[PDB]
């Protein structure tokens, strides 16, 4: 499920203490803060409080909510 890498999957900037690593709880990828600034619940995983997701997973969720 979760993978790891040394850089953001969207912008390829390398993580460091000044640009920390974060995982998307929906897709398992790694992203910088700028590309994972939103959080959403993941009911299909039994998670009902907002957890961090990447922009792509956030859009997917938002599309379902306002469909
Ligand atoms: Zn990034
Ligand atoms: Zn994601």
Swiss-Prot record:
Signal peptide: none annotated. Zn(2+) 2 binds at residues 24, 27, 54, 57. Zn(2+) 1 binds at residues 8, 11, 32, 35. It is found in: Endosome membrane. A zinc finger (FYVE-type) spans 2-62. Coiled coil: none annotated. Present with 172 molecules/cell in log phase SD medium. Component of the ESCRT-0 complex composed of HSE1 and VPS27. Interacts with ENT3 and ENT5, the ESCRT-I subunits VPS23 and VPS28 and with the COPIb subunits SEC27, SEC28 and SEC33. May form a complex composed of VPS27, HSE1 and DOA1. Interacts with DOA1. Interacts with ubiquitin. Component of the ESCRT-0 complex which is the sorting receptor for ubiquitinated cargo proteins at the multivesicular body (MVB) and recruits ESCRT-I to the MVB outer membrane. Controls exit from the prevacuolar compartment (PVC) in both the forward direction to the vacuole and the return to the Golgi. Allows VPS10 to return to the (trans-Golgi network) TGN from the PVC. Might also function as an alternate adapter in the COPIb clathrin-like coat. Belongs to the VPS27 family. The FYVE domain is involved in the binding to phosphatidylinositol 3-phosphate (PtdIns(3)P) which is required for the association to endosomal membranes. Both IUM domains are necessary for efficient binding to ubiquitin. This is Vacuolar protein sorting-associated protein 27. It comes from Saccharomyces cerevisiae (strain ATCC 204508 / S288c) (Baker's yeast). The chain holds residues 169 to 230 of 622 of the full protein.
């Amino acid at each position: 499920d979760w993978i790891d890498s040394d850089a953001c999957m969207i912008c390829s900037k390398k993580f460091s203490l000044l640009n920390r690593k974060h995982h998307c709880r929906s897709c398992g990828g790694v992203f910088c803060q700028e590309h994972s600034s939103n959080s959403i619940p993941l009911p299909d995983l039994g998670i009902y409080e907002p957890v961090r997701v990447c922009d792509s997973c956030f859009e997917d969720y938002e599309f379902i909510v306002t469909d």
